[PDB]
C-alpha cells in the first residue's frame, strides 16, 4: 500500500500496486495530475534516507519535482584546519561561492580560507584588538571586520589587502556590522556600511568616497544591533531597552522609538535578512552581468519574500535579556504584534528562514525553539544539546537548521519533521560560529580549539 504526500504537506490517493519501478512511480503520479514532470521520492519519514526499503527490515511516499533545489544534509567532516592563534569568534561565507570563507579570532586577526582545498589562504592583519565581527558585503567584493579597537577596517578577499586605513570614530568596541542592501544601491555604486558600537552611537560609512555620512547618536545606552533593511529603513536595539527606526532618506532622522521592552534589547533580526546579505545572489552562483542587471535581480529575490500581499511587509523579531521576545511589522505597527515566551535562560541568537516563513531561537537552556514567523506562534522545541546553544544557520531551502554549541558537538535539524537529522561530534572544545552556504554544500565550524572545521554532505 502507498500514499502519496508532497514535502509541502498535501495528502495526493490510497493504492496499493505490488513493488515497482521507480521510473513508474513518477508516470502513476504524473498520471493523476496529467502532467504527460520528473519526480523524486522519499520515504521513512533520524532515517530519511530512500522494494529495496523492504528489503532493510503500508508506505507513505514523500515526492518533489526535481526542478526543485533541495539541500543535502552535512554528514562527515574534513581534517581540522589550523591558522589562529586563539578561540575563533566569527564566520561567515561569501555570498557569492562556497569557496571562500572569512573568521574572526581573538589573536586580533581575521582569516580568508580556500573551502575546495580547506587551506589557509589569507592572513588579515591590522586589528590591535579582537575581531568580533567579520561580513562579506552582498555583492561580494569587499570584507567588513568590526573589531574590539573600536575600528572597522575593509579588506579585499582576493588578494587579502587591507583597503587603506581603518575607518575610525567609534570610541567604543564594535557591536553589530550591517550592509546596505543591493536593491536599493544605484548601479555603479556600492553599498554603503552601518556599524553599531558599545558608545551608543550608529555611524554610516561611504566606502567608496572613505567618509562617514551620518552618526546616529539618540539611545541613551549601549547600541546592541542594527539591521539595514530594504525600504531605507535601519532598526537598532540598545541596552536602553529601546527599538529605534532611522530614515536614511531623512539623513538618518529617527521616525520610531519602540519602547514596549522593559529590559535591555540584545537581538534584533529580520525576515529578509538573508536575502538583503546576499543580494542577487543564490545557489546556482550565477553572476549579474551587468550593475544593472544585479539591481534588478536583488529586487526580485527580495520582493519575492516580502512581498507577500501585494505589498512589502519585513517582520522584525527582537530579544531582550528577560527572555522574552517580540515580533513587529514596524510599517503596519509600533506595537508587538506577539510575544514569544518560554525560553528559561538567555536567548543567544534570533534568525527567520530565508523564506520569512520561520523564526529559530538558540538559548543558553541548552535548547532551540521554532516559531512561525508570520504570527510567532510557537511550533516545537529542538532537544539533544546537552550544553548551551551558542548559535544556528538556516540552509538557503529553509529545510535544514545546523547548531552549534558548548558541548563541543554540532547538530542539523529537519526543520519539516522538527527533529534531529544528523548529529556530529569533532571539535574538542566548545564551538562559537557555525555557517552554512547558500548552495548548501559545505559547512563551517569554529570556537575554543582554534580550529576551523569545514562540513559536507
Given at each position: 500500500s502507498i500514499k502519496f504526500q508532497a514535502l509541502d504537506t498535501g495528502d495526493n490517493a490510497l493504492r496499493v500496486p505490488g513493488?515497482?519501478?521507480?521510473?513508474?512511480?513518477?508516470?502513476?503520479?504524473?498520471?493523476?495530475?496529467?502532467?504527460?514532470?520528473?519526480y523524486t521520492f522519499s520515504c521513512t519519514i533520524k532515517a530519511s534516507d530512500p522494494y529495496s526499503?523492504?528489503?532493510?527490515?503500508?508506505?507513505?511516499?514523500?515526492?518533489?519535482?526535481?526542478?526543485?533545489?533541495?539541500?543535502?544534509?552535512?554528514?562527515?567532516?574534513?581534517?581540522?584546519?589550523?591558522?589562529?592563534?586563539?578561540?575563533?569568534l566569527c564566520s561567515a561565507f561569501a555570498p557569492h561561492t562556497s569557496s571562500r570563507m572569512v573568521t574572526g579570532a581573538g589573536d586580533n586577526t581575521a582569516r580568508i580560507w580556500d573551502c575546495d582545498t580547506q587551506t589557509p589562504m589569507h592572513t588579515l592583519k591590522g586589528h590591535y584588538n579582537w575581531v568580533l565581527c567579520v561580513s562579506w558585503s552582498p555583492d561580494g567584493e569587499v570584507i567588513a571586520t568590526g573589531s574590539m579597537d573600536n575600528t572597522i577596517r575593509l579588506?579585499?578577499?582576493?588578494?587579502?589587502?587591507?583597503?587603506g586605513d581603518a575607518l575610525r570614530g567609534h570610541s567604543k568596541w564594535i557591536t553589530s556590522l550591517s550592509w546596505e542592501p543591493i536593491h536599493l544601491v544605484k548601479?555603479?555604486?556600492?553599498?554603503?556600511?552601518?556599524?553599531?558600537?558599545?558608545?551608543?552611537?550608529?555611524?554610516?560609512?561611504?566606502?567608496?568616497?572613505?567618509?562617514?555620512?551620518?552618526?546616529?547618536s539618540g539611545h541613551t545606552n549601549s547600541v546592541s544591533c542594527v539591521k539595514w533593511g530594504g525600504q531605507g529603513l535601519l532598526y537598532s536595539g540598545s541596552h536602553d531597552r529601546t527599538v529605534r527606526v532611522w530614515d536614511i532618506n531623512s539623513?538618518?532622522?529617527?521616525?520610531?522609538?519602540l519602547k514596549s521592552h522593559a529590559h535591555w534589547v540584545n537581538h534584533l533580526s529580520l525576515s529578509t535578512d538573508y536575502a538583503?546579505?546576499?543580494?542577487?545572489?543564490?545557489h546556482t552562483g550565477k553572476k549579474p552581468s551587468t550593475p544593472e542587471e544585479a539591481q534588478k535581480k536583488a529586487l526580485e529575490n527580495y520582493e519575492k519574500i516580502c512581498?507577500?500581499?501585494?505589498?512589502?511587509?519585513?517582520?522584525?523579531?527582537?530579544?531582550?535579556?528577560?527572555?522574552?521576545?517580540?515580533?513587529?511589522?514596524?510599517?503596519?505597527?509600533?506595537?508587538?504584534?506577539?510575544?514569544?515566551?518560554?525560553?528559561?535562560?538567555?536567548?543567544?541568537?534570533?534568525?527567520f528562514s530565508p523564506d520569512g516563513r520561520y523564526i529559530v531561537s538558540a538559548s543558553f537552556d541548552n535548547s532551540i525553539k521554532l516559531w512561525d514567523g508570520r504570527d510567532g506562534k510557537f511550533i516545537s522545541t529542538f532537544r539533544g544539546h546537552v550544553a548551551s546553544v551558542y548559535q544556528v544557520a538556516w540552509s538557503s531551502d529553509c529545510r535544514l537548521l545546523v547548531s552549534c554549541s558548548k558541548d563541543t558537538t554540532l547538530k542539523v535539524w529537519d526543520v519539516r519533521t522538527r527533529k534531529l537529522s544528523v548529529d556530529l561530534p569533532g571539535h574538542k572544545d566548545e564551538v562559537y560560529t557555525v555557517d552554512w552556504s547558500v548552495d548548501g554544500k559545505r559547512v563551517c565550524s569554529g570556537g575554543k580549539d582554534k580550529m576551523v572545521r569545514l562540513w559536507t554532505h
Open positions: 513493488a515497482i519501478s521507480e521510473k513508474q512511480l513518477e508516470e502513476l503520479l504524473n498520471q493523476l495530475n496529467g502532467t504527460s514532470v520528473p526499503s523492504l528489503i532493510k527490515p503500508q508506505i507513505t511516499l514523500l515526492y518533489t519535482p526535481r526542478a526543485v533545489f533541495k539541500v543535502k544534509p552535512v554528514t562527515r567532516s574534513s581534517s581540522a584546519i589550523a591558522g589562529h592563534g586563539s578561540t575563533i579588506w579585499d578577499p582576493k588578494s587579502g589587502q587591507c583597503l548601479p555603479g555604486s556600492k553599498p554603503r556600511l552601518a556599524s553599531s558600537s558599545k558608545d551608543g552611537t550608529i555611524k554610516i560609512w561611504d566606502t567608496v568616497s572613505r567618509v562617514c555620512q551620518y552618526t546616529m539623513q538618518g532622522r529617527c521616525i520610531n522609538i538583503l546579505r546576499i543580494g542577487a545572489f543564490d512581498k507577500k500581499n501585494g505589498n512589502s511587509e519585513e517582520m522584525m523579531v527582537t530579544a531582550s535579556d528577560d527572555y522574552t521576545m517580540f515580533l513587529w511589522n514596524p510599517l503596519k505597527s509600533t506595537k508587538p504584534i506577539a510575544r514569544m515566551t518560554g525560553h528559561q535562560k538567555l536567548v543567544n541568537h534570533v534568525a
